[PDB]
Design an enzyme around this catalytic site. Structure first.
Site, PDB file in Angstrom:
ATOM      1  N   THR A   2      -1.435   0.185  11.575  1.00 24.32           N
ATOM      2  CA  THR A   2      -0.211  -0.663  11.705  1.00 24.32           C
ATOM      3  C   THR A   2       1.066   0.050  11.492  1.00 24.32           C
ATOM      4  O   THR A   2       1.108   0.710  10.736  1.00 24.32           O
ATOM      5  CB  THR A   2      -0.375  -1.765  10.796  1.00 24.32           C
ATOM      6  N   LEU A   3       2.029  -0.261  12.493  1.00 22.52           N
ATOM      7  CA  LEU A   3       3.310   0.333  12.314  1.00 22.52           C
ATOM      8  C   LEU A   3       4.478  -0.849  11.442  1.00 22.52           C
ATOM      9  O   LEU A   3       5.417  -0.390  11.142  1.00 22.52           O
ATOM     10  CB  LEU A   3       3.901   0.842  13.630  1.00 22.52           C
ATOM     11  N   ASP A  19      -3.954  -6.503   9.077  1.00 19.53           N
ATOM     12  CA  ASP A  19      -4.356  -5.709   7.882  1.00 19.53           C
ATOM     13  C   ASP A  19      -5.273  -6.659   6.625  1.00 19.53           C
ATOM     14  O   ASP A  19      -6.023  -6.027   5.997  1.00 19.53           O
ATOM     15  CB  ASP A  19      -3.117  -5.161   7.249  1.00 19.53           C
TER      16      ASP A  19
END
Lengths: 256, 124
Positions: free
Chosen positions: A1-2, A59
């Site tokens: 994940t960014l 997440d």
């Protein structure tokens, strides 16, 4: 994940005389768009441990998977109820996952709450664990659990971790936490704890754009982990000045 | 000097004769206006008459258009007596002063202050 894409807002967890009460609205937003309005954000880890999250939903689902299988393997090796992992154990595990991911610059974009009962002396639920059946849904009474036997942990993106009598995430760290530091007390009944949590959630509904008033309450007590029936929180404005028509104010000047 | 009655400068006795002549010019229009105050109201009454000027009153004149009462704002009006060009000019000056006040301060000017600001303009 960014970075966050689909996010939940805030969780509140407090100790009261019968265990843990944790709350989160059932909302996950796609930016300013309230795409999902019936999302579960508090998960059962085992009969004595729950996980709440704010931040990115993907997440959080990853972490929930990790803990689900960790609890499964724990039950696979169990020979007595004492062998089950405590909330402290899961909090340590999550803090470690976060620390390792920070060192790689690959964090989960979440703040996490791990809460539960840190003792096995209050009941015999972990003597015969049911993963796929629930018997609470019989006419026994809650046992008062000493605060020292209860656990509420916090983990953030950088791995910061600590425990307390009440933990908040997101905007609750400002609105709810203020009222809790002013007004929380030990050995509260379910009624008082619920009233305080509801006041915090009402303020959040009035002041946090990402929040909703559809609240999921979860309890961890001598009877195990109980999901209450989701309910709509009634939030009315606390002043008639808001509702006064603009045309009754002076037409001149910056009257708005 | 020989021009002390031509400009707004003091004469030997201390008079500014131009001001007196402007007042006489107002008087020459032969227009009469009366304002009266009540306890909770105020009234202005004026003649719907063309000021005595170079031109006379024609029978094709639209007498409804003849007036000496103007609105400055919705709540402030006035009577302007004197030379019609000057009266229209003062009306516009007063309207712009009131509008500027409203924008600057976020509330309507009251009549006293508008009059005082107009007179500060005239002093120049």
């Amino acid at each position: 994940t960014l970075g966050p894409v689909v996010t939940g807002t805030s969780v509140i967890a407090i100790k009261y005389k019968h265990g843990i009460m944790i709350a989160a609205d059932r909302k996950a937003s796609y930016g300013s768009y309230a795409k999902f309005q019936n999302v579960e954000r508090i998960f059962k880890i085992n009969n004595k441990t729950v996980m709440g999250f704010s931040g990115e939903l993907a997440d959080a689902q990853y972490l929930h998977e990790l803990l689900t299988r960790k609890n499964i393997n724990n039950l696979s090796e169990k020979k007595r109820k004492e062998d089950m992992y405590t909330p402290q154990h899961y909090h340590s595990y999550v803090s470690r996952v976060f620390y390792v991911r920070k060192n790689r610059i690959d964090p989960l974009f979440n703040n996490i709450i791990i809460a539960g009962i840190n003792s096995q002396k209050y009941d015999n639920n972990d003597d015969n664990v049911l993963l796929y059946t629930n018997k609470n849904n019989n006419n026994e009474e809650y046992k008062e659990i000493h605060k020292d036997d209860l656990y509420i942990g916090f983990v953030d993106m950088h791995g910061t971790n600590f425990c307390d009598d009440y933990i908040t995430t997101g905007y609750a760290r400002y609105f709810a936490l203020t009222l809790l530091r002013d007004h929380y007390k030990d050995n509260m009944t379910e009624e008082e704890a619920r009233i305080l949590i509801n006041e915090c959630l009402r303020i959040l509904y009035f002041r946090d754009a990402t929040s909703s008033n559809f609240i999921q309450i979860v309890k961890v007590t001598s009877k195990g982990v109980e999901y209450e029936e989701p309910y709509i929180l009634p939030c009315v404005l606390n002043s008639a000045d808001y509702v006064y028509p603009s045309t009754l104010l002076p037409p001149a000047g910056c009257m708005w | 000097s020989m021009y002390d009655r031509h400009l707004t400068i003091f004469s030997p006795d201390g008079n500014l004769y131009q001001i007196e002549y402007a007042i006489k010019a107002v008087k020459n229009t032969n227009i009469t206006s009366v304002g009266v105050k009540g306890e909770n109201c105020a009234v202005i009454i004026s003649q719907k008459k063309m000021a005595t000027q170079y031109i006379s009153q024609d029978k094709l004149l639209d007498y409804n258009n003849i007036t000496n009462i103007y609105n400055i704002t919705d709540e402030i009006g006035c009577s302007m007596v004197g030379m019609p060009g000057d009266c229209l000019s003062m009306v516009y000056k007063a309207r712009s002063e009131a509008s500027e006040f409203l924008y600057s301060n976020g509330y309507n000017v009251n009549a006293e202050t508008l009059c005082r600001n107009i007179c500060d303009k005239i002093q120049v």
